[PDB]
């Protein structure tokens, strides 16, 4: 396999389906990436992640650079070996969580200093030490809402940081030859800033383009409005990655607007909290109505959990605080997300994605 | 298969190896039973429990009679169906944990009343509703130390309760025809009381005989001293079950004294707390010395954890509080216990158990 090759096999409107080929494996798109915080997809062995259909996982950098440390992971053979996942890993830059999770942060043009310095150069180096396959440029995730002036200042700094990220990645031969680098479009909800950001990123040149700054509480209508004008600004022939999204209906609508890749903690985190996704909408398995329900979490789901255990049993486990409850809910939810992506890919390939989206919504929101 | 058949295939001194055949499966003896609290072996799917080599698990009754409730489990199809374990389950009577975990307990000849009535009859009924394969008679676990008078009074009540348990079990045709009933020897550390208890139990007649009251903080020397005279008092041709034991060296010495069955929470509970069993003794994986150790938990262990992950990774997971850490430590520890039992069975079958016990101790305590 090549370092990186994205091929589009079929299209319907703005939606696309295809593959990314990388040295460590093929990624089917549109793709959902389960999130690995701290070198684990919470409550799942990697073989179980793979059994759900995942082709790639996201590794959070912020936690790993603190514990166990990036240099330590490199000394131990890299993240893939360490956690036992041998397929592609996309790593975030660490910049978003440094702001969310640190104390006493101090921002400058050089980077961010924080207490538990992270610059573009150090972020790219950390991602190299982890052995990331898809490296994210280091940027500033603009708060929402943002004034036009502040959104512009933040986007402009992020574009300067994108060039620094590109140059740091290219100056490390092993990384440049074996990994890919994605740039991140910013600009808040403002069309002119989104266009300037797209133009700057395309001039630098990246292997893929993320739409940043949209998992920030703005609501689906506004997110879709921004995607409507933002995704067409990005190069058509490269993957489009919507960071931090999202709920099933967010994914469907984002694919309808040209997005190829997704990640979010919802299936894992909300699974451990008792929320199970089904084709008829989410359910909270802790509800007393499930205490004697012998049906599986979802009546059509093909996952191992739905083949073997009832709602009543999982209700009991989650109410009791049992680890197996978290394991089963997470496996089912990640499997549900992968089945959603498979239905999306198949429907685009067959020219019936518009109908699929309509049928999906009618049933999910009934 | 029959309802119950215990066959001894080989013997060395007081040690025995053989099989218990029951409707739901064969149990190889000496046997270690992983403990299922609240209808789950904590942090493991049943298929993983089986992959470690377990033939039978122990279900705690006290928790289940409270949550989800025995009648509810019966309505849902029984414990086996509920949790997805189709092999034999031994259930405790609930009497020990009612004393440990309840408030405002009130004891009488009829049974025990408590706040979150449990009589011999109700205990046997609960175990029936769960669908237990091996039912334990309801008894009083005598505190340690106990005066001779108090040990005698408690043992005498337990023998009256053993007869009530026998009669309740026999009066339920489906239970009598499909399950087995074990009686529990009491008498604290006193040889004369242990003999009276053995005689009373043998007169009633049971499918197997437990040695009760020895997982109570008395120390290994005293436990072994009591086993030395207590196990020969029980019928030779029936299984001997040492309840609540124990550490690996406790198991080896108890087998040398004629015990066939064991259960304890040590491998599961202490696994979640960071203690891993190895042929060279236990280690605490949280210790900083393991942070860069690429070896598996144990250098000879055949378990899936030791084939795939390093000490350094599991150290990281346990320090981070990650669910996968609990999963991996528990799988390894239960696998270690099953490998110990396999080595015990093979060495007795080959007439070299005395040498095995000596070699085991020399290395485990080096
Ligand atoms: Cl998560
Ligand atoms: Cl436990
Ligand atoms: Zn499922
Ligand atoms: Zn192992």
């Amino acid at each position: 396999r090549p370092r990186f090759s994205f091929s589009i096999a079929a299209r319907e409107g703005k939606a696309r389906t295809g593959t990314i080929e990388m040295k460590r494996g093929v990624i089917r798109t549109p793709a959902f990436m389960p999130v690995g915080t701290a070198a684990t997809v919470k409550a799942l062995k990697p073989e179980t992640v793979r059994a759900t259909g995942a082709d790639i996982i996201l590794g959070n950098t912020y936690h790993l650079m603190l514990r166990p440390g990036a240099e330590r992971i490199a000394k131990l053979g890299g993240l893939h070996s360490f956690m036992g996942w041998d397929r592609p890993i996309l790593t975030d830059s660490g910049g978003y969580q440094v702001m969310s999770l640190s104390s006493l942060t101090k921002q400058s043009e050089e980077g961010v200093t924080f207490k538990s310095m992270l610059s573009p150069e150090r972020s790219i180096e950390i991602q190299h030490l982890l052995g990331s396959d898809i490296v994210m440029a280091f940027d500033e995730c603009t708060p929402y809402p943002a004034t036009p002036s502040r959104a512009a200042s933040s986007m402009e700094r992020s574009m300067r940081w994108a060039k620094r990220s590109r140059d740091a990645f290219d100056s490390r031969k092993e990384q440049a030859e074996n990994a890919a680098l994605f740039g991140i479009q910013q600009g808040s909800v403002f069309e002119n800033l989104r266009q300037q950001s797209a133009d700057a990123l395309a001039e630098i040149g990246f292997d893929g383009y993320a739409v940043g700054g949209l998992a920030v509480g703005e609501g689906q209508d506004e997110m879709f409005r921004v995607l409507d004008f933002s995704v067409p600004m990005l190069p058509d022939d490269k993957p489009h990655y919507l960071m931090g999204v999202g709920k099933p209906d967010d994914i469907v609508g984002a694919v309808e607007r040209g997005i190829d890749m997704f990640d979010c903690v919802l299936p894992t985190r909300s699974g451990r909290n008792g929320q199970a996704f089904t084709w008829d909408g989410p359910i909270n398995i802790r509800n007393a109505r499930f205490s004697e329900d012998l049906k599986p979490l979802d009546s059509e789901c093909h996952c191992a959990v739905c083949q073997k255990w009832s709602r009543a049993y999982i209700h009991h486990l989650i109410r009791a605080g049992e680890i197996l409850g978290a394991m089963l809910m997470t496996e089912h939810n990640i499997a549900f997300y992968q089945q959603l992506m498979q239905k999306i890919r198949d429907s685009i390939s067959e020219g019936r994605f518009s109908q699929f989206a309509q049928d999906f919504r009618a049933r999910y929101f009934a």
Side-chain angles (χ1 to χ4, degrees), chain A residues 1-22 24-66 68-74 76-95 97-98 101-102 105 107-109 111-114 117-149 151-172 175-202 204-246 248-288 290-307 309-366:
Chain A
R1 282 183 297 266
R3 177 191 71 85
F4 190 86
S5 180
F6 176 54
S7 178
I8 295 168
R11 310 190 74 145
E12 181 173 342
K14 294 177 169 186
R16 310 101 71 76
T17 190
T19 54
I20 305 168
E21 294 194 354
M22 303 193 68
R24 290 187 166 101
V26 179
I27 302 152
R28 296 168 287 176
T29 69
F32 182 77
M33 301 182 281
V35 176
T37 318
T40 166
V41 179
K42 289 181 191 289
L44 299 181
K45 287 177 179 179
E47 65 203 64
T48 309
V49 179
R50 178 58 184 170
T52 71
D55 293 328
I56 173 167
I57 64 172
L58 183 149
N60 287 142
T61 290
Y62 171 81
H63 298 276
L64 293 178
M65 71 179 286
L66 299 169
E71 279 82 359
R72 175 171 290 171
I73 284 170
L76 297 176
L79 179 58
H80 292 86
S81 176
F82 187 60
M83 74 183 287
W85 171 269
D86 69 7
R87 279 172 188 277
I89 296 175
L90 183 149
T91 47
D92 61 23
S93 76
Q97 291 185 316
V98 167
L101 300 168
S102 298
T105 56
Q107 292 173 102
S108 70
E109 186 65 22
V112 60
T113 300
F114 68 95
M117 165 65 73
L118 192 52
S119 59
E121 294 78 17
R122 176 60 179 163
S123 174
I124 299 304
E125 183 191 25
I126 289 165
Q127 296 180 71
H128 168 67
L129 291 165
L130 297 174
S132 173
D133 303 283
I134 302 176
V135 175
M136 296 306 299
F138 184 75
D139 77 339
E140 222 168 52
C141 184
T142 306
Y144 179 80
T147 68
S149 166
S153 291
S154 177
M155 177 277 291
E156 292 159 4
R157 173 173 280 176
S158 288
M159 299 303 91
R160 294 189 296 268
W161 287 357
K163 174 60 170 157
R164 283 169 62 189
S165 295
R166 176 83 264 179
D167 290 349
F169 181 97
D170 291 339
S171 296
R172 189 171 286 109
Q175 186 170 39
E177 287 174 18
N178 294 291
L181 184 68
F182 281 26
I184 305 168
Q185 186 200 44
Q186 294 290 350
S188 182
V189 302
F190 304 111
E191 183 169 14
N192 68 323
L193 300 184
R194 287 276 171 188
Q195 181 68 249
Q196 295 176 24
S197 181
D199 290 343
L201 293 173
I204 296 164
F206 291 93
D207 295 309
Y209 298 83
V211 178
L214 290 185
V216 293
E218 75 276 17
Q220 189 192 77
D221 291 5
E222 183 75 344
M223 181 174 75
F224 284 177
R225 184 184 74 81
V226 175
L227 290 174
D228 286 337
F229 59 69
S230 294
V231 186
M233 300 170 174
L234 306 176
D236 183 73
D237 68 346
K238 301 288 194 222
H240 307 150
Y241 168 26
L242 183 57
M243 295 171 58
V245 175
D249 46 310
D250 295 334
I251 291 176
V252 173
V255 171
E256 293 180 283
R257 291 163 174 83
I259 297 298
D260 308 302
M261 298 170 65
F262 298 92
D263 75 277
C264 70
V265 300
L266 191 61
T268 41
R269 184 181 296 178
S270 87
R272 303 194 301 280
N273 192 231
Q275 176 167 249
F277 293 93
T278 86
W279 303 106
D280 299 290
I283 62 175
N284 196 306
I285 202 63
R286 296 185 62 105
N287 193 285
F290 299 115
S291 71
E292 298 186 352
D293 189 341
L294 287 171
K295 299 188 295 302
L297 290 171
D298 177 275
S299 66
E300 295 174 15
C301 180
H302 301 104
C303 90
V305 182
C306 294
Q307 302 330 287
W309 296 281
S310 65
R311 287 165 173 196
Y313 181 60
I314 298 167
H315 166 89
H316 159 71
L317 292 176
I318 293 288
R319 282 241 185 165
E322 284 286 348
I323 289 167
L324 184 60
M327 293 163 55
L328 296 183
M329 289 287 296
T330 299
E331 177 172 0
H332 164 78
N333 280 348
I334 293 294
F336 178 89
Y337 267 65
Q338 294 302 331
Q339 285 166 96
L340 171 61
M341 305 317 295
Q342 187 64 57
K343 290 174 181 281
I344 290 171
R345 291 191 295 263
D346 292 342
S347 70
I348 298 162
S349 297
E350 295 177 6
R352 52 176 187 80
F353 174 57
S354 174
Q355 190 62 52
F356 168 75
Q358 182 175 318
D359 295 342
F360 168 82
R361 286 189 277 259
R363 179 174 174 188
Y364 194 83
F365 295 114

